[PDB]
Paper text:
The Gabija system consists of two genes, gajA and gajB, both of which are indispensable for its anti-phage activity. The other component of the Gabija system, GajB, was predicted as a UvrD-like helicase, but its function is unknown.
To gain structural insight into the function of GajB in Gabija-mediated anti-phage defense, the crystal structure of selenomethionyl GajB was determined to a resolution of 2.0 Å using single-wavelength anomalous diffraction. The asymmetric unit contained a single GajB chain and 265 water molecules. Several GajB residues (1, 18–26, 62–66 and 193–198) were not modeled in the final structure due to insufficient electron density. The crystal structure of GajB revealed a four-subdomain architecture, in which N- and C-terminal domains are each divided further into a RecA-like core subdomain and an accessory subdomain. The two accessory subdomains are formed as inserts within the respective core subdomains. GajB shares the four-subdomain architecture with UvrD that includes two RecA-like subdomains (1A and 2A) and two additional subdomains (1B and 2B). The root-mean-square deviation (RMSD) values between the Ncore and Ccore subdomains of GajB and their counterparts (the 1A and 2A subdomains, respectively) in UvrD were 1.9 Å and 2.8 Å for the 115 and 141 Cα atoms, respectively. In the Cacc subdomain of GajB, it is difficult to recognize even a partial structural resemblance to the 2B subdomain of UvrD. The gating helix and the GIG motif in subdomain 2B of UvrD, which are involved in formation of the ssDNA gateway and dsDNA binding, respectively, are missing in GajB. It also lacks the separation pin, which is a β-hairpin motif in the 2A subdomain of UvrD that contacts the ds-ssDNA junction.
Author numbering: 2 to 17, 27 to 61, 67 to 192, 199 to 494
Write the structure that this text describes.
Amino acid sequence: SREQIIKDGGNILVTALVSKIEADLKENKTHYSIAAVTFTNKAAKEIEGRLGNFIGTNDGFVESEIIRPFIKDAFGNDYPDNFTAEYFDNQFASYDKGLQVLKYQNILGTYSNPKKNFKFQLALDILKKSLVARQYIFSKYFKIFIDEYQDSDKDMHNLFMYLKDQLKIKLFIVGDPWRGAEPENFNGLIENSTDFNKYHLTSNFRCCQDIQNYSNLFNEETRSLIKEKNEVQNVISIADDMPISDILLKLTEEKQVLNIEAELVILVRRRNQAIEIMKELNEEGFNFIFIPQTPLDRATPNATLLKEVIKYVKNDRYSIYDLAAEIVGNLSSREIKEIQKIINELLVPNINQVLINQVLINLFAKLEITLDTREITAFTEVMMTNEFDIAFDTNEYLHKIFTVHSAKGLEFNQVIITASDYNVHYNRDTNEHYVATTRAKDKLIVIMDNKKYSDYIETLMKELKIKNIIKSI
């Protein structure tokens, strides 16, 4: 359930955040603050965006809230508090050597073993050795929010448990059952812990109740999740009794169930449908653009970073810092510039497959990340043509057409789909239909042009004694 989580004041495990922080901050009456910690600055910024508390990365939290302010009190004055964090060089094999590098080179470095986390070991050691540190953290925070917990390493887990068990801080933990990852942390809590309430959320939780309800109707497994409303507002059915341009005018100006001034996305199955639709719409005063599928639209491990590199290469106004926000950790501008220097070699005149291959190797080597050869192939293909450029564009486009595939993992405010694109009555297009119906946050329109689809909906409604699932206009 959703509102149950909101009512829940204690330690929480969620299997798959901004929602709970907003609520908890509202009803907080005390002086205590919250902290939200992510793996990436991208994830942090996204939270800080929708909101005296701490919102930042794991590494920024332990460095700024624990290590820097209290290392001298814990270890003595000969330890620095103006050290530099370095992710790339100055790796080491033991805690004592890490202490040496910090003490003598003024560098907060990393273990060479990715399963060990020097910063978090250091932070825990400092808490255990400094009353002042414990008193600060104790009186500062009442709750900490932690993202992607399945990727947390053993030392992160040790610190968070200590915060919970010694400094009386509640934990709100989100994850999904990364080189540092110890999945047993999160799994262990799920299977064994007695001091957490535990919830499971489906992928469409983000959506408004009407959109959750509709999308949950179609799979036998999610039907039980449906919480019927007396009336439906945000999922709408419209007849295909007029051209798409008239349909759009009816939705926006006549019935005003769509806002033409907000983001509006039409989902199709194929490029040729998008062309058809654009050929009409843009001749009738609209201005839609089709965002093509690209070779990087595969579920590959490094898809996100690879798309960022392409964005940077092809758009001279795109900032290297936005690329860097997607990299795990809290890299200094100095290190980001070392990454920039590597990537900039893709900008030489007459770039070719050989050079590109070399850049990719240099980059992912530096990031200590394994690269699939088929990723190199897909990346190189995008580099060597302008065919897919619009998909990596920096411009903001309000009115867009996507295939359901290109739309995967994206979120829009308003979405139009066409029933005849999904033959779910014959158990076809069922994953695509779930994806398509859950892209929208606030408004979903179904062009109802498929008799078997609509009959199928009515059949399920009768079976479930549902009276309202979609608003017909």
